[PDB]
Design a protein around this motif. Structure first.
Motif, PDB file in Angstrom:
ATOM      1  N   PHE A 174       0.817  -1.362   0.172  1.00 33.94           N
ATOM      2  CA  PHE A 174       0.038  -0.034  -0.121  1.00 33.94           C
ATOM      3  C   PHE A 174       0.811   1.270   0.078  1.00 33.94           C
ATOM      4  O   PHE A 174       0.245   2.399  -0.409  1.00 33.94           O
ATOM      5  CB  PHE A 174      -1.030   0.053   1.311  1.00 33.94           C
ATOM      6  N   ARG A 175       1.956   1.323   0.606  1.00 28.84           N
ATOM      7  CA  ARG A 175       2.950   2.441   0.626  1.00 28.84           C
ATOM      8  C   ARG A 175       3.199   2.807  -0.770  1.00 28.84           C
ATOM      9  O   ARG A 175       3.430   4.202  -1.344  1.00 28.84           O
ATOM     10  CB  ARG A 175       4.292   2.186   1.249  1.00 28.84           C
ATOM     11  N   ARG A 176       3.428   1.954  -1.737  1.00 27.50           N
ATOM     12  CA  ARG A 176       3.898   2.201  -3.064  1.00 27.50           C
ATOM     13  C   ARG A 176       2.511   2.700  -3.666  1.00 27.50           C
ATOM     14  O   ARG A 176       2.658   3.792  -4.670  1.00 27.50           O
ATOM     15  CB  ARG A 176       4.382   0.909  -3.958  1.00 27.50           C
ATOM     16  N   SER A 177       1.440   2.223  -3.471  1.00 31.38           N
ATOM     17  CA  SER A 177       0.145   2.765  -4.316  1.00 31.38           C
ATOM     18  C   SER A 177       0.108   4.405  -3.640  1.00 31.38           C
ATOM     19  O   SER A 177      -0.317   5.115  -4.524  1.00 31.38           O
ATOM     20  CB  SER A 177      -0.823   1.857  -3.984  1.00 31.38           C
ATOM     21  N   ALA A 178       0.229   4.377  -2.541  1.00 28.58           N
ATOM     22  CA  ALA A 178       0.049   5.906  -1.885  1.00 28.58           C
ATOM     23  C   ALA A 178       1.033   6.529  -2.527  1.00 28.58           C
ATOM     24  O   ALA A 178       0.569   7.946  -2.825  1.00 28.58           O
ATOM     25  CB  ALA A 178       0.004   5.852  -0.536  1.00 28.58           C
ATOM     26  N   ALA A 179       2.455   6.214  -2.823  1.00 33.28           N
ATOM     27  CA  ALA A 179       3.313   7.092  -3.154  1.00 33.28           C
ATOM     28  C   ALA A 179       3.093   7.464  -4.848  1.00 33.28           C
ATOM     29  O   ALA A 179       3.517   8.318  -5.201  1.00 33.28           O
ATOM     30  CB  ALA A 179       4.539   6.583  -3.151  1.00 33.28           C
ATOM     31  N   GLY A 180       2.511   6.310  -5.369  1.00 33.11           N
ATOM     32  CA  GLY A 180       2.121   6.657  -6.900  1.00 33.11           C
ATOM     33  C   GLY A 180       0.922   7.215  -7.153  1.00 33.11           C
ATOM     34  O   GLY A 180       0.582   7.296  -8.467  1.00 33.11           O
ATOM     35  N   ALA A 181       0.162   7.920  -6.181  1.00 35.14           N
ATOM     36  CA  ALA A 181      -1.250   8.526  -6.347  1.00 35.14           C
ATOM     37  C   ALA A 181      -0.953   9.867  -6.107  1.00 35.14           C
ATOM     38  O   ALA A 181      -1.559  10.809  -7.048  1.00 35.14           O
ATOM     39  CB  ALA A 181      -2.103   7.878  -5.419  1.00 35.14           C
ATOM     40  N   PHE A 182      -0.284  10.380  -5.251  1.00 36.58           N
ATOM     41  CA  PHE A 182      -0.138  11.817  -5.107  1.00 36.58           C
ATOM     42  C   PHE A 182       1.055  12.475  -5.607  1.00 36.58           C
ATOM     43  O   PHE A 182       2.014  11.447  -6.318  1.00 36.58           O
ATOM     44  CB  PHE A 182      -0.523  12.217  -3.524  1.00 36.58           C
ATOM     45  N   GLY A 183       1.700  13.724  -5.420  1.00 36.28           N
ATOM     46  CA  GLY A 183       2.741  14.279  -5.543  1.00 36.28           C
ATOM     47  C   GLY A 183       2.537  14.666  -7.275  1.00 36.28           C
ATOM     48  O   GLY A 183       1.886  14.574  -7.865  1.00 36.28           O
ATOM     49  N   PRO A 184       3.836  15.310  -7.656  1.00 34.64           N
ATOM     50  CA  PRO A 184       3.766  15.681  -9.172  1.00 34.64           C
ATOM     51  C   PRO A 184       3.635  14.746  -9.773  1.00 34.64           C
ATOM     52  O   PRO A 184       4.017  13.509  -9.769  1.00 34.64           O
ATOM     53  CB  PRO A 184       5.139  16.532  -9.089  1.00 34.64           C
ATOM     54  N   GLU A 185       3.309  14.683 -11.061  1.00 34.68           N
ATOM     55  CA  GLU A 185       3.111  13.910 -12.025  1.00 34.68           C
ATOM     56  C   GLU A 185       4.352  13.280 -12.829  1.00 34.68           C
ATOM     57  O   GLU A 185       4.586  12.285 -12.914  1.00 34.68           O
ATOM     58  CB  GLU A 185       2.237  14.307 -13.317  1.00 34.68           C
ATOM     59  N   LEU A 186       5.415  14.059 -12.696  1.00 32.18           N
ATOM     60  CA  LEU A 186       6.693  13.774 -13.412  1.00 32.18           C
ATOM     61  C   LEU A 186       7.478  12.927 -12.211  1.00 32.18           C
ATOM     62  O   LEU A 186       8.037  11.872 -12.611  1.00 32.18           O
ATOM     63  CB  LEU A 186       7.629  14.985 -13.564  1.00 32.18           C
ATOM     64  N   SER A 187       7.124  13.276 -11.044  1.00 26.73           N
ATOM     65  CA  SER A 187       7.761  12.596  -9.822  1.00 26.73           C
ATOM     66  C   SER A 187       6.827  11.534  -9.335  1.00 26.73           C
ATOM     67  O   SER A 187       6.641  11.569  -8.184  1.00 26.73           O
ATOM     68  CB  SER A 187       8.261  13.562  -8.977  1.00 26.73           C
TER      69      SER A 187
ATOM     70  N   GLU B 257      16.893  25.183  -8.974  1.00 30.30           N
ATOM     71  CA  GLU B 257      15.458  25.909  -9.349  1.00 30.30           C
ATOM     72  C   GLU B 257      15.819  27.133  -9.305  1.00 30.30           C
ATOM     73  O   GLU B 257      15.389  28.218  -9.952  1.00 30.30           O
ATOM     74  CB  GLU B 257      14.371  25.385  -8.281  1.00 30.30           C
ATOM     75  N   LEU B 258      16.670  27.951  -8.399  1.00 35.13           N
ATOM     76  CA  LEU B 258      16.984  29.201  -8.246  1.00 35.13           C
ATOM     77  C   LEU B 258      17.774  29.799  -9.602  1.00 35.13           C
ATOM     78  O   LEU B 258      17.454  30.824  -9.901  1.00 35.13           O
ATOM     79  CB  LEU B 258      17.951  29.628  -6.888  1.00 35.13           C
ATOM     80  N   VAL B 259      18.664  28.908 -10.053  1.00 35.21           N
ATOM     81  CA  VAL B 259      19.323  29.688 -11.122  1.00 35.21           C
ATOM     82  C   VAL B 259      18.447  29.440 -12.371  1.00 35.21           C
ATOM     83  O   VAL B 259      18.542  30.446 -13.370  1.00 35.21           O
ATOM     84  CB  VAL B 259      20.723  28.770 -11.434  1.00 35.21           C
ATOM     85  N   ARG B 260      17.570  28.551 -12.720  1.00 36.12           N
ATOM     86  CA  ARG B 260      16.577  28.554 -13.675  1.00 36.12           C
ATOM     87  C   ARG B 260      15.699  29.819 -13.472  1.00 36.12           C
ATOM     88  O   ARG B 260      15.274  30.432 -14.521  1.00 36.12           O
ATOM     89  CB  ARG B 260      15.839  27.360 -13.852  1.00 36.12           C
ATOM     90  N   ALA B 261      15.410  30.009 -12.395  1.00 37.91           N
ATOM     91  CA  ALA B 261      14.445  31.078 -11.829  1.00 37.91           C
ATOM     92  C   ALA B 261      15.328  32.730 -12.289  1.00 37.91           C
ATOM     93  O   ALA B 261      14.502  33.649 -12.791  1.00 37.91           O
ATOM     94  CB  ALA B 261      13.817  31.371 -10.583  1.00 37.91           C
TER      95      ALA B 261
ATOM     96  N   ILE C  72      17.635  12.894  -7.442  1.00 37.55           N
ATOM     97  CA  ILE C  72      16.863  12.998  -8.695  1.00 37.55           C
ATOM     98  C   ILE C  72      15.144  13.174  -8.731  1.00 37.55           C
ATOM     99  O   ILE C  72      14.893  14.022  -9.407  1.00 37.55           O
ATOM    100  CB  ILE C  72      17.566  12.157  -9.740  1.00 37.55           C
ATOM    101  N   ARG C  73      14.796  12.303  -7.862  1.00 40.68           N
ATOM    102  CA  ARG C  73      13.381  12.426  -7.814  1.00 40.68           C
ATOM    103  C   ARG C  73      12.751  13.784  -7.286  1.00 40.68           C
ATOM    104  O   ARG C  73      12.022  14.222  -7.726  1.00 40.68           O
ATOM    105  CB  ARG C  73      12.823  11.462  -6.859  1.00 40.68           C
ATOM    106  N   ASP C  74      13.479  14.462  -6.281  1.00 39.83           N
ATOM    107  CA  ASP C  74      13.236  15.842  -5.874  1.00 39.83           C
ATOM    108  C   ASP C  74      13.307  16.674  -6.686  1.00 39.83           C
ATOM    109  O   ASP C  74      12.588  17.700  -6.767  1.00 39.83           O
ATOM    110  CB  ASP C  74      14.087  15.855  -4.466  1.00 39.83           C
ATOM    111  N   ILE C  75      14.485  16.823  -7.593  1.00 44.31           N
ATOM    112  CA  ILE C  75      14.782  17.745  -8.540  1.00 44.31           C
ATOM    113  C   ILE C  75      13.728  17.675  -9.629  1.00 44.31           C
ATOM    114  O   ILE C  75      13.348  18.781 -10.280  1.00 44.31           O
ATOM    115  CB  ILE C  75      16.335  17.676  -9.052  1.00 44.31           C
ATOM    116  N   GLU C  76      13.391  16.465 -10.049  1.00 47.42           N
ATOM    117  CA  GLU C  76      12.649  16.296 -11.264  1.00 47.42           C
ATOM    118  C   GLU C  76      11.028  16.887 -10.556  1.00 47.42           C
ATOM    119  O   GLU C  76      10.230  17.307 -11.265  1.00 47.42           O
ATOM    120  CB  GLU C  76      12.253  14.906 -11.660  1.00 47.42           C
ATOM    121  N   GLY C  77      10.502  16.630  -9.254  1.00 48.12           N
ATOM    122  CA  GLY C  77       9.537  16.915  -8.753  1.00 48.12           C
ATOM    123  C   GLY C  77       9.396  18.587  -8.671  1.00 48.12           C
ATOM    124  O   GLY C  77       8.209  19.191  -8.777  1.00 48.12           O
TER     125      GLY C  77
END
Lengths: 271, 68, 68
Positions: free
Chosen positions: A42-55, B36-40, A132-137
């Motif tokens: 269920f953790r995977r499904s919860a993580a895969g429903a919310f949040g940004p679409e890219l992340s 994000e700061l540099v792209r902004a 990388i997940r955070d930066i794409e999000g």
């Protein structure tokens, strides 16, 4: 994969399979789900429903590998408990069996410790992926804004071309497009540079762990010669055990080889 | 007025960067916020350039029409 | 225990320096605090050196007497 030109689930046997026939499927593959835990699935499904679409897929991968890590720590604790139980059980048997079981338990405990170290390295790799997940999000809101603004531009230019915000919105769109282009470039560089580096670190951990367990297996296989398969008739009994020094030397050599092992000491040479 | 939110976002993000790097340099969002700061910053540079051009070109034209 | 207040003061003063330089770089106490920090750093360096010498010389001597 060892598949074949076939429409069945059977796979192409290898040289080891030809030499050693495969055992029947495990009796521990019981029919409940293979789930392991409700939170696990269920953790995977919860993580895969919310949040940004890219992340979204990346978050699912991170959660799935976190479940991997939890199950690996569980199996490491289980294996160390098995080693402790074997060492405890070795007392009731003969002296040679007791010593052999003690050394085997030591080797299994060492394997569990190496598994724990690999667990730590795996968590480091998982954090690298999380970056990388955070930066794409964080990048995703930029393109979301870009599409929203271009949709607004299309709507305004379709409903009333002579709108008061005739060109301010267009200039804002072009500056957002420049920002999104920079964001996409940096996202590509960072994603493709931390994928090739996190996976390189993961593979280094994999090969180190595999080599260490291979050395452990070889040393245990060489130690198992002190145990004897000679059967005793009911009347007779063996002379006293005298292979204590041999076992001590073999475990000392195993420890020395494990300590000496380095990245350049790996004997595996892929073609 | 539409350009102003860009620089407002830039200052807010740089303030967040300073706060995070002062309180805990080893933050999980160590470099994502910087990127994000540099792209902004690039977006704000383009915005400032276009704002300067449009302001200085529609001031010299609106006032020319007014003087005519 | 007497040496510890020196380093406690050093960390407190460097924290104050970081806070002042983050909140307002053009503070009236722009460089007086920095000079006080560097003199405290010299004092703490001397304190650390003497602490190392005395600790490592009275450990090897008290334990030598104990072993005798």
């Amino acid at each position: 994969m060892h598949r074949t030109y076939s429409l069945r689930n059977s796979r192409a046997p290898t040289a080891s399979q030809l030499q050693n026939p495969p055992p029947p499927p495990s009796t521990t593959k019981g029919r409940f789900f293979g789930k392991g835990g409700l939170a696990y699935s269920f953790r995977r499904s919860a993580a895969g429903a919310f949040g940004p679409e890219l992340s979204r897929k990346l978050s699912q991968l991170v959660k799935i590998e976190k479940n991997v890590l939890r199950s690996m720590e569980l199996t490491a604790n289980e294996r160390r408990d098995a080693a402790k139980q074997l060492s405890i059980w070795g007392l009731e048997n003969d002296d040679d069996v007791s010593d052999i079981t003690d050394k085997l338990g030591v080797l299994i405990y060492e394997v569990s410790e190496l598994d724990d170290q690999f667990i730590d390295r795996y968590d480091q790799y998982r954090l690298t992926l999380k970056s990388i997940r955070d930066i794409e999000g964080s990048v995703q809101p930029s393109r979301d804004r870009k599409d929203k603004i271009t949709d607004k531009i299309a709507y305004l230019k379709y409903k009333d071309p002579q709108s008061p915000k005739i060109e301010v919105l267009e200039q804002e769109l072009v500056r957002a497009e420049a920002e999104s282009l920079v964001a996409e470039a940096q996202l590509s560089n960072i994603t493709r540079s931390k994928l090739r580096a996190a996976f390189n670190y993961q593979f280094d951990s994999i090969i180190e762990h595999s080599e260490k367990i291979a050395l452990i297996a070889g040393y245990g296989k060489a130690l198992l010669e002190l145990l004897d398969d000679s059967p005793v008739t009911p009347g007779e009994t063996r002379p006293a055990y005298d292979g204590y020094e041999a076992s001590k030397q073999i475990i000392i050599d195993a420890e020395s080889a494990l300590n000496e092992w380095t990245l350049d000491s790996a004997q595996v040479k892929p073609t």
